[PDB]
Amino acid sequence: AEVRTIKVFTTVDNINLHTQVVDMSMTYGQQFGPTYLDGADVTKIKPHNSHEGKTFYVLPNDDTLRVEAFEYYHTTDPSFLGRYMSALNHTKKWKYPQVNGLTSIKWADNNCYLATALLTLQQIELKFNPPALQDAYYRARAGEAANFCALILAYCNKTVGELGDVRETMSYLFQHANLDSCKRVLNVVCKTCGQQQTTLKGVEAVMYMGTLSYEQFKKGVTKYLVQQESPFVMMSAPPAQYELKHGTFTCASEYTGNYQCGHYKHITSKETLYCIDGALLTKSSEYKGPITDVFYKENSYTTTIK
Ligand SMILES: Cc1ccc(N)cc1C(=O)N[C@H](C)c1cccc2ccccc12
Ligand SMILES: [Zn+2]
Ligand SMILES: [Zn+2]
């Protein structure tokens, strides 16, 4: 049989391309292990004349790719690239409309939690350690968030169509952001026992579960905030009917519904109050509803309590 070939580029990061020659009589799986073309799995398919020149992903089956891959994703999960492509295969069909000055995601495949989280990240100062996330966040800020959402699914071990928790997701991303300058000192007091002062750093320093109001946390829940050093704070608690006031907060997640089967919305404080429901938009001067996460910006705070 006539043995024909084409040339292609393989990569793990789409930053280093490595020219390959493929036998057209064999599937890519017989030459590259698993193989993808914008996420679509091409392991079981044989080369086409049109694939010549095009860039193909591969699993890091050789030391170069392993290095390239860790340097780019900051992970060694042997399944990461696969889960990123499969997700990407899906998130590329999503629409990412600009809603109220920000990138959003039209509802599809239970992505309400990804949308609310993508709106939140555009609004708080976050610097990602993995290049993959740095690169995809920057393209994402410009309405091309298909890769950003697909990497989030793969970093948070979720599959398209499953519902996630906003707070759990953001927690994952925080583990990949550079939040080392972040500190938190708490003081707790009893009139009989004593007082316990905790100090927290990093991810734990910007996240709290039990209250939605920063102001309450500075007065007392007796636990009170003594010092906080962070670009922002995330205040979280199980959904409770709550009232947000223009100007007192940056953003917030509304979780309507039941445990692991509800709907998420994002409220943002700009010149007025806006509800960003995926690709839908309402404005209002006040807002009340089932709120679970409030986000407040910050630089430095020190208490006056003694
Ligand atoms: C969407 C989702 C996916 C995975 C997991 N593990 C949880 C959730 C989820 O529903 N979280 C909301 C905010 C929630 C959190 C905490 C307590 C809650 C009690 C009652 C209702 C909602 C509650
Ligand atoms: Zn006591
Ligand atoms: Zn208490």
From Swiss-Prot:
A zinc finger (C4-type) spans 190-221. It is a multi-pass membrane protein. Changing V67A: Partial loss of ISG15 cleavage in vitro. Inhibited in vitro by GRL-0617. Residues 3-58 form the Ubiquitin-like domain. Zn(2+) 6 binds at C190, C193. Responsible for the cleavages located at the N-terminus of the replicase polyprotein. Participates together with nsp4 in the assembly of virally-induced cytoplasmic double-membrane vesicles necessary for viral replication. Antagonizes innate immune induction of type I interferon by blocking the phosphorylation, dimerization and subsequent nuclear translocation of host IRF3. Also prevents host NF-kappa-B signaling. In addition, PL-PRO possesses a deubiquitinating/deISGylating activity and processes both 'Lys-48'- and 'Lys-63'-linked polyubiquitin chains from cellular substrates. May form homohexamers. Interacts with N protein. This is Papain-like protease nsp3. The gene is rep.
